[PDB]
From a paper:
Finally, a 2.5 Å resolution X-ray crystal structure of its hexamer was determined through the newly developed multi-well X-ray crystallography technique of Turkish Light Source conducted at ambient temperature, elucidating the conformational differences between the hexamers of both INSv and IAsp. Molecular replacement with a dimer in the asymmetric unit facilitated the solution of the crystal structures of INSv insulin at pH 7.5. Specifically, amino acid residues 1–8 exhibited a “T” conformation in one monomer and an “R” conformation in the other with well-defined electron densities. The hexameric configuration of INSv is organized near a crystallographic 3-fold axis aligned with the central channel. However, unlike the IAsp structure, a distinct feature of the INSv hexamer in the R form involves the outward orientation of Asn3 in chain B relative to the interior of the channel. This spatial configuration leads to a less stable electrostatic interaction with the two symmetry-related AsnB3 residues. According to b-factor analysis from X-ray crystallography, significant mobility is observed up to the 26th residue in the R state form of INSv, which is clearly reflected in the H/D exchange map. The INSv analog demonstrated higher deuterium exchange compared to IAsp (after a 1440-minute reaction, n = 3), displaying a more kinetic conformation for INSv analog compared to IAsp, agreeing with the findings of B-factor of INSv crystal structure and DSC analysis.
Insulin plays a critical role in regulating cellular glucose uptake. Insulin is primarily hexameric (consist of six identical monomer ~36 KDa) and dimeric (consist of two identical monomer ~12 KDa) during production, delivery, and circulation. Although it assembles into dimers and hexamers during its biosynthesis and storage, insulin is always active as a monomer. Serving as a pivotal model in the evolution and application of X-ray crystallographic techniques, the hexamer functions as a stable reservoir of the hormone within both the secretory granules of pancreatic β-cells and pharmaceutical formulations.
Numbering used by the authors:
A (entry chain D), B (entry chain B), C (entry chain D), D (entry chain B), E (entry chain D), F (entry chain B): 1 to 30
G (entry chain C), H (entry chain C), I (entry chain C), J (entry chain A), K (entry chain A), L (entry chain A): 1 to 21
The structure:
Amino acid sequence: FVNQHLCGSHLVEALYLVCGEKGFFYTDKT
Amino acid sequence: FVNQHLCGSHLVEALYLVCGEKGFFYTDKT
Amino acid sequence: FVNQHLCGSHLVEALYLVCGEKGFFYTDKT
Amino acid sequence: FVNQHLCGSHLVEALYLVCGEKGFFYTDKT
Amino acid sequence: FVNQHLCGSHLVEALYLVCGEKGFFYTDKT
Amino acid sequence: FVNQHLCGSHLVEALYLVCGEKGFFYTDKT
Amino acid sequence: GIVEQCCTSICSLYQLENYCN
Amino acid sequence: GIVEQCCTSICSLYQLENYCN
Amino acid sequence: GIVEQCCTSICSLYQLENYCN
Amino acid sequence: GIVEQCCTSICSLYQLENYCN
Amino acid sequence: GIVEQCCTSICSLYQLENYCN
Amino acid sequence: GIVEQCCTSICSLYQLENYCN
Ligand SMILES: [Cl-]
Ligand SMILES: [Cl-]
Ligand SMILES: [Zn+2]
Ligand SMILES: [Zn+2]
């Protein structure tokens, strides 16, 4: 529908590629 | 659970599966 | 829309991580 | 088709692509 | 909704598996 | 950006993330 | 089945463990 | 194109082979 | 947040770089 | 099994089909 | 860190939970 | 090609952009 679970599954991988050594903080709430 | 070496995106992927609504922090700084 | 194909693509990976040595039987019909 | 070593989730991923509506059984017990 | 971005993310991997040595040309416009 | 060896599907995955609407050509012929 | 349960709504690790052998 | 054919409806391996070089 | 911005609409690499440390 | 054929060594398509239901 | 425990070596589930918020 | 530069060795971002259409 807008399945935020499967979408976040892609977002976290994209963030692992983009951030690199910096890392990132991920929260499924904003 | 799986008993292997998770590396790369896979790492974060499992952090997405285990944590859930809690969220996770990802820092690969050795 | 509710694309069960892309969703099952994630489900099978999550099941590979969760089951581990046990394995799993997957059918896209119930 | 690709001629490489598929391992980890990738393995199941191709089982998801090749089988289809038939389904597959995944058992990594050596 | 029909999120063509996440769907193309799966399509490109499926194409990498299917084409193999041949390769493929991918464009998100037809 | 990440500083590692991308191989397999991962390769194309980053081509999907970096290029975007431009598109990419994928040929692994050595 | 797994496909009518874990696509419309998200399934946790414990819910996904049911379908393991 | 591949994106108007293999997103609304699922594409098999044979359908995905059309777009290979 | 990232989830209300990068799911309804696609986020580029530059947009995804905001949430890095 | 499946790993020792397709992960330890390389599998073909018709060897992949041997594990479908 | 996380890599040297779960990638260099093998992690368990409760070692995975140590990096959740 | 692309593999011998980014898989055999490590690529940068602007080396990645060399394979975009
Ligand atoms: Cl999706
Ligand atoms: Cl890998
Ligand atoms: Zn998806
Ligand atoms: Zn991988």
